[PDB]
Amino acid sequence: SYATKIHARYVYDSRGNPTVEVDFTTDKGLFRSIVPSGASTGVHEALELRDGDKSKWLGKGVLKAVANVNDIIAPALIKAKIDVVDQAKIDEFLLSLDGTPNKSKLGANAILGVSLAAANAAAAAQGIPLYKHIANISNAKKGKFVLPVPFQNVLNGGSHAGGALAFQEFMIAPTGVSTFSEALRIGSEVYHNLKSLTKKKYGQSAGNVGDEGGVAPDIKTPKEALDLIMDAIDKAGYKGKVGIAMDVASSEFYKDGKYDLDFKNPESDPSKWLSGPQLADLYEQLISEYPIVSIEDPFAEDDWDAWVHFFERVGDKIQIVGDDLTVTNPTRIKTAIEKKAANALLLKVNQIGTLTESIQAANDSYAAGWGVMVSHRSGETEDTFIADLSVGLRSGQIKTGAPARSERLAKLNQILRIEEELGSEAIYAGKDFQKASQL
Amino acid sequence: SYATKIHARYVYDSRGNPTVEVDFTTDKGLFRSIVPSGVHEALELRDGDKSKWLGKGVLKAVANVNDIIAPALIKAKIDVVDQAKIDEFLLSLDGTPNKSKLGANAILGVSLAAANAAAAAQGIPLYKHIANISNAKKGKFVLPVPFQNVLNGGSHAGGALAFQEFMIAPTGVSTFSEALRIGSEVYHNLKSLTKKKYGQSAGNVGDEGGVAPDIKTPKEALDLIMDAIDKAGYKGKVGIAMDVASSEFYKDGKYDLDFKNPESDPSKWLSGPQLADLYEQLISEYPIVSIEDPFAEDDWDAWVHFFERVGDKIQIVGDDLTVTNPTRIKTAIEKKAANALLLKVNQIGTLTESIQAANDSYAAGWGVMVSHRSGETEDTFIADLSVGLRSGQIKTGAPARSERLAKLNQILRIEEELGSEAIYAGKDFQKASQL
Ligand SMILES: O=C(O)[C@@H](CO)OP(=O)(O)O
Ligand SMILES: [Mg+2]
Ligand SMILES: [Mg+2]
Ligand SMILES: [Mg+2]
């Protein structure tokens, strides 16, 4: 099976900004993939190509990226007649057209849609589900399929919501149940309880949501957020069954070698900005005070010494996830493994730009004993690729939003479909999320 | 082409509540539909088990599809292209006047999925199959004006603002693509202005993707929208629509525009005529092109009087008035209460009945605005429905949250597919079905 037609268009993401959609046609039909887009994007991410025409979409058009697909990538790839099942060859071909380390000739947002749609087409060519094709090409361990713990960002801050809260994501992780369906039900019940409690304490507007569907109360401290979530877990009836995770996204508030926990205040007092050591101490206290099982981007994207020190302190007690640190990039992951800076990778296909490189990132992580959490971006779409990716890679953990806003539920609903299809051939990762690939 | 397998499951809607999804398999493949969620409505069946989803499970509706509808329909071997026969069969199976045995949520999923299978059986897009079975005027397809709910009040905001929905309608351009782009730009400008004026928190979004700052008066809301249109660079090109949802503040035959204040002075509540005056003033000061539920759901005389006043200058839309209900619709047409209907397919429960309600409206010279629900999904059926029915109007949210954008994105795909065989309804949205 090879591409007969490849056509790109722009569509609107969940924030109302344009992004790239690719239609990849073979003998088996038309396969569509849509590229997501971040807000708190790491400086080391592959290039997201935007038009910069201030008169259209506030400079956020993707007409140039779409044209790169239609006029450069499409005719070259179609001429090549590459078997879509050979994902590595598809991706090698796409990388050859760009020839830059950060995909800055064509744009990662031109390349990725083609890479992902090829994988969908390949699944169809073999008459297998996408998650099985991914398990094949990633060399996942053979046995039961592992369904991921849904890490649900139920309270949004940082760059994803207006208000004072600096830390980006406060997540629940329903690890203390035996099935994915139960975990999603519990997440939805805790979330609804949280919405009710948030409106009662902070007013109706606090129950409106951030970019990823979490409630967005205007609060200044992590303690206030965590206390709210603990109350929701308790009032929903699931005390002791629900872990908490954070994405600090600390690069967003790293200034003058320090960390501003009031960074959205134009008049933030710089005498109150924390050093690396001061911020590390705050985490150690929170990890003791709350059932926090995972912290992501606790220090800035190149603040290696701070990660290394913190890992020495608490790496055996919690999952420590690289996101902006690692940017789903094997070269950065190598450095992080050598330095002992983290013990898990946040896997974002659009940080690196091809499925093959994303899978290499995952396998490099697994080889080092790391966990992998497959992730959405804050600018998401109706695309559901990451659901199948999370299952195929046997990650045992996915981050794809609060159980609100359908760019989030679309992924969670797809896992429900996968769970039903597999029946007893699947197990839910549950408490084993961190080492799920080995199960 | 007939059903070889029909299977339902629950999935989660855009508010995190369960809803029904149907997989309908034929020789052409698997076709999926998902049902949305919000005495005159078809009834959605919920489980009421307070220990699961706070009583909002749809296990019973799902079981009705799997154990009752699927085997009966599969046995009957009905050609899916014959939507009317499919829906007649489904209605016969239930037999109740409001679909309360099997549930409207069980019935609609099968009805919509069958339509998708039927399009595939004929090798045509869903919007074309809908055009065919609805007997839409032959000629160019009409792409709808997106009525985009950018700013919320009423029960959706903590301020005094009594009116429920403020929408933009980018009518002053020649293409759907340009309309949607302008809508996105105006929305982003509105968000920015809202955060500046009311604080960063006021930028966080409601169920349909709009913002809900603490606003005091309709004038304050409309001035904010006008400022966003102007700052975005599209002065004169963008209409405004309102959903007043006036039943929410109708008390003792009067209209309390400060209904969220428990000490609202009843001597300041507006009479029907005073509220009509207010609307007339707003229509003269702002480019308001449509008002939904300007008067309460059974305050018929008020609608009739208001229609005689301004029915020739603006669209007047029934929602609570009409409830996608054939008899309420008849009454409204006979009384001359309004000139447009909100079409909510899940309020009536089959595609055939939805199309009948649209055609009854068109026959009376009414407009039809195809509508989302508050609880939406990644399903895009209503995009193809708005195009196939030649409605010229769709209400499917702000340009934020993908249960809203998925519909608008589908229209982009339809637009590209059609090229010169499509026209944008633009300023002609009211009578688009006759364009
Ligand atoms: O930092 C993050 O983990 C992401 C995903 O939630 O947000 P964004 O896509 O804006 O980077
Ligand atoms: Mg980020
Ligand atoms: Mg992150
Ligand atoms: Mg209404």
mmCIF file of C-alpha atoms and ligand atoms in Angstrom, chain A residues 15 37-41 45 153 160 168-169 212 247 249 296-297 323-324 346 348 375-379 399, ligand 1:
data_model
loop_
_atom_site.group_PDB
_atom_site.id
_atom_site.type_symbol
_atom_site.label_atom_id
_atom_site.label_comp_id
_atom_site.label_asym_id
_atom_site.label_seq_id
_atom_site.Cartn_x
_atom_site.Cartn_y
_atom_site.Cartn_z
ATOM 1 C CA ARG A 15 -8.386 27.555 20.908
ATOM 2 C CA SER A 37 -0.206 23.013 18.854
ATOM 3 C CA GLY A 38 1.292 24.036 22.211
ATOM 4 C CA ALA A 39 1.145 27.294 24.164
ATOM 5 C CA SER A 40 3.875 26.581 26.746
ATOM 6 C CA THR A 41 6.222 25.393 24.025
ATOM 7 C CA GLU A 45 10.796 22.000 20.174
ATOM 8 C CA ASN A 153 -5.756 18.037 34.256
ATOM 9 C CA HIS A 160 -3.549 27.821 30.008
ATOM 10 C CA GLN A 168 0.198 24.974 34.812
ATOM 11 C CA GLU A 169 -1.591 21.669 35.536
ATOM 12 C CA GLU A 212 -7.487 21.918 28.800
ATOM 13 C CA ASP A 247 2.897 19.936 35.456
ATOM 14 C CA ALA A 249 5.798 24.127 33.319
ATOM 15 C CA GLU A 296 6.553 17.391 35.376
ATOM 16 C CA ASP A 297 9.006 20.186 34.458
ATOM 17 C CA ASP A 323 8.668 17.764 28.921
ATOM 18 C CA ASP A 324 10.358 21.010 27.851
ATOM 19 C CA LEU A 346 6.381 13.253 28.264
ATOM 20 C CA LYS A 348 4.602 14.731 22.331
ATOM 21 C CA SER A 375 0.534 13.565 25.821
ATOM 22 C CA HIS A 376 -1.787 15.967 24.042
ATOM 23 C CA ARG A 377 -0.997 19.655 23.459
ATOM 24 C CA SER A 378 -3.050 22.479 24.970
ATOM 25 C CA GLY A 379 -4.170 23.305 21.410
ATOM 26 C CA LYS A 399 -2.265 12.956 29.615
HETATM 27 O O1 LIG C 1 3.264 21.691 28.929
HETATM 28 C C1 LIG C 1 2.424 20.784 28.628
HETATM 29 O O2 LIG C 1 2.560 19.632 29.100
HETATM 30 C C2 LIG C 1 1.321 20.977 27.579
HETATM 31 C C3 LIG C 1 0.258 19.863 27.528
HETATM 32 O O3 LIG C 1 -0.719 19.992 28.554
HETATM 33 O O4 LIG C 1 0.698 22.273 27.448
HETATM 34 P P1 LIG C 1 1.266 22.904 26.059
HETATM 35 O O5 LIG C 1 0.745 22.046 24.944
HETATM 36 O O6 LIG C 1 0.796 24.324 25.974
HETATM 37 O O7 LIG C 1 2.759 22.771 26.188
#
